[PDB]
Amino acid sequence: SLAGAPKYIEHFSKFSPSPLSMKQFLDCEKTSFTFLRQELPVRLANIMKEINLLPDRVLSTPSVQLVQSWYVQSLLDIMEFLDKDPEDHRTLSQFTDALVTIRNRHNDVVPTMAQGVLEYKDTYGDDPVSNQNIQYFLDRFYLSRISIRMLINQHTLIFHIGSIDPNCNVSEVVKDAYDMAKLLCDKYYMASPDLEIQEINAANSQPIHMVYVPSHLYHMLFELFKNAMRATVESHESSLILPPIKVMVALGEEDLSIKMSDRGGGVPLRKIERLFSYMGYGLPISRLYAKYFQGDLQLFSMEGFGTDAVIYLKALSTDSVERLPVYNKSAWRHYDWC
Amino acid sequence: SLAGAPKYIEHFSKFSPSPLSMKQFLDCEKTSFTFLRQELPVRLANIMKEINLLPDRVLSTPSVQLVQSWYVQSLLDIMEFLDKDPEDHRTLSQFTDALVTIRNRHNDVVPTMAQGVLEYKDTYGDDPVSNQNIQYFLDRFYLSRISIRMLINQHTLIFHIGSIDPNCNVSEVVKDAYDMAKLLCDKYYMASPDLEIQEINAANSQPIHMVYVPSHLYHMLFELFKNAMRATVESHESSLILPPIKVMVALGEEDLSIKMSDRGGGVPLRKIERLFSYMGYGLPISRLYAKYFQGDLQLFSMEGFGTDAVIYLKALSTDSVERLPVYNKSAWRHYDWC
Numbered sequence A, B: 001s002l003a004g005a006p007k008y009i010e011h012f013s014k015f016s017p018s019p020l021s022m023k024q025f026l027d028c029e030k031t032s033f034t035f036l037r038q039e040l041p042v043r044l045a046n047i048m049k050e051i052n053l054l055p056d057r058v059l060s061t062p063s064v065q066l067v068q069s070w071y072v073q074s075l076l077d078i079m080e081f082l083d084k085d086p087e088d089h090r091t092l093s094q095f096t097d098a099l100v101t102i103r104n105r106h107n108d109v110v111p112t113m114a115q116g117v118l119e120y121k122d123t124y125g126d127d128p129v130s131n132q133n134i135q136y137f138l139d140r141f142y143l144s145r146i147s148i149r150m151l152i153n154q155h156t157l158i159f160h161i162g163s164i165d166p167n168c169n170v171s172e173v174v175k176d177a178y179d180m181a182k183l184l185c186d187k188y189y190m191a192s193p194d195l196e197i198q199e200i201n202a203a204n205s206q207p208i209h210m211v212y213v214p215s216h217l218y219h220m221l222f223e224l225f226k227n228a229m230r231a232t233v234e235s236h237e238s239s240l241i242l243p244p245i246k247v248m249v250a251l252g253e254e255d256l257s258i259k260m261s262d263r264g265g266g267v268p269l270r271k272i273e274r275l276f277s278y279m280g281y282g283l284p285i286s287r288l289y290a291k292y293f294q295g296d297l298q299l300f301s302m303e304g305f306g307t308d309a310v311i312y313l314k315a316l317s318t319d320s321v322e323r324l325p326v327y328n329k330s331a332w333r334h335y336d337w338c
């Protein structure tokens, strides 16, 4: 009773995704339904059109085809709601059930796509042109996915504000991530570095809080602690005294910056880019979480000494706007030294 | 008696520049002459072809036309030597005189091009497409120029190895740059931060030395000290105690890294890119000096606290290879979010 999926994909891919600010999220169920039965199809269709620009070699892999098939079914699942009445309580409850089913369907997207990359390399061998396309695509695909999960989680949790903490204590999240990383480091190495936190609240020399999704911040910090701890222990195999991991949390007028400093011996500059290369997606996905609300995650090493990692977040909820890829000419097109 | 310049430009722009390593420089006058009467025309012609890809608006400015005219005359100056005998001592002495004349002719290229950029903005207004082209071009143009000056200085100084110190003591250059920056800071503010240097020689816990052009390293460090000192003093107007500027010099297996840390209050991430934008070229040109021998210069701030600047250099002279732009399809061609 639905049209073929390509007709829906072509229809909804003409629209641009609509980015929301953290303030908008933070600040009804019928309104959410009527918004999402347009917006989720727009976001699904825009990235499905980009999948189709991948090299034939990558698109031919079974795991990429599988993920594509999930996106198709999820789009069709929502098309079932196009003619349904928001005033009918049953529409709203069925819609929430459908979003839960979509979220579960897509639970394993990240490792399934990674298997697709491995299939491409195993079947054909990799080549730099395809690899550059894959890198460009996967950043956008995984950020798109983060944004779809955000919309679904907000709706299902609401019907904290959903997953958003309006008073997230950043140092508490740092400590939670440290604690969990320490459990893992202690398991494998029987030791771990200590934590030192310093806060710099420039305008109010007050604990630092923000509006944020704590799970996203935790995810980033946990990945950074795992790397910093492993570096510290493995670079100190002959020492019983481990240098601590030092975290600075700074609150400025526009940025809330979190620096994690280790004395793990570092890595040469040549190898920094590889750390964000898909060709263990912990670091690239962590950086996407930072970018999702107009932040960033940057690494700076001193080979022979150690590494600084900085999470840059927007301090203000009004500056914290979704960063969403859009399928258009610039995107389509995107697919000199001696 | 020479052909028209376009015939030479077309001829020599077909060749790629030939990058030399620091080791090759470090490791005859007739050989230098016969090399340079090919290589300097190749480098001049390759970048002259790129000037021609600039937007009409930029190319139409009098200061860009003036610089172009210098490059034309310098190319023709060298064409006078195509049929001259290297065995004749007079050829060699006349060649050195000609290179000195070229260097003097081009002494003011950097501010003259900057005046061209200002003329473009004043005459037409700037636009983002032209601005992106200008940014791409000027990085390559100024790196090309650095490389031409290197070749000329090596020849004229030789006929230290030319401008190269095979045993450059990095901390001594840091101190020289600090001293000169302190003179300026003291003049305007009647105070300046102190310097603290720490060395980390990972394999030989020995003063850190390298093969490098000390003037280039000095240039980078002087620019970084000026910024760090200004930030520190201006962010501490109510304090008599100034936080020091801390420099770490680290020697690893592949990198020699120099970090300059200040507590000058920093800058929001949004504004970092502007610091390397031509649209006061001290920071972008300093980064080009770092890139010239396969290094880099990176800035990382914590708004509300301060800024780290890192100069990344290659530790080994065999890894220190000229980074040269080349005129080819990729370069010619070079001229998606919500």
Ligand SMILES: O=S(=O)(c1ccc(O)cc1O)N1Cc2ccc(NC3CCNCC3)cc2C1
Binding pocket: A223, A224, A225, A227, A228, A230, A231, A234, A235, A262, A264, A265, A266, A267, A275, A299, A301, A306, A307, A309
């Ligand atoms: O790349 S890293 O500098 C880094 C990246 C990310 C980040 O967030 C933090 C970081 O420090 N770093 C991780 C790591 C892990 C293991 C080892 N083992 C080496 C084995 C041989 N002997 C020396 C130690 C070294 C390093 C170095």
Ligand SMILES: O=S(=O)(c1ccc(O)cc1O)N1Cc2ccc(NC3CCNCC3)cc2C1
Binding pocket: B223, B224, B225, B227, B228, B230, B231, B234, B235, B262, B264, B265, B266, B267, B275, B299, B301, B306, B307, B309
């Ligand atoms: O951008 S920077 O962080 C920077 C860039 C480069 C670099 O190598 C080092 C750096 O620190 N920095 C330079 C500078 C210069 C002047 C001021 N004056 C402000 C006026 C209003 N009150 C606060 C101070 C601030 C800053 C900040």
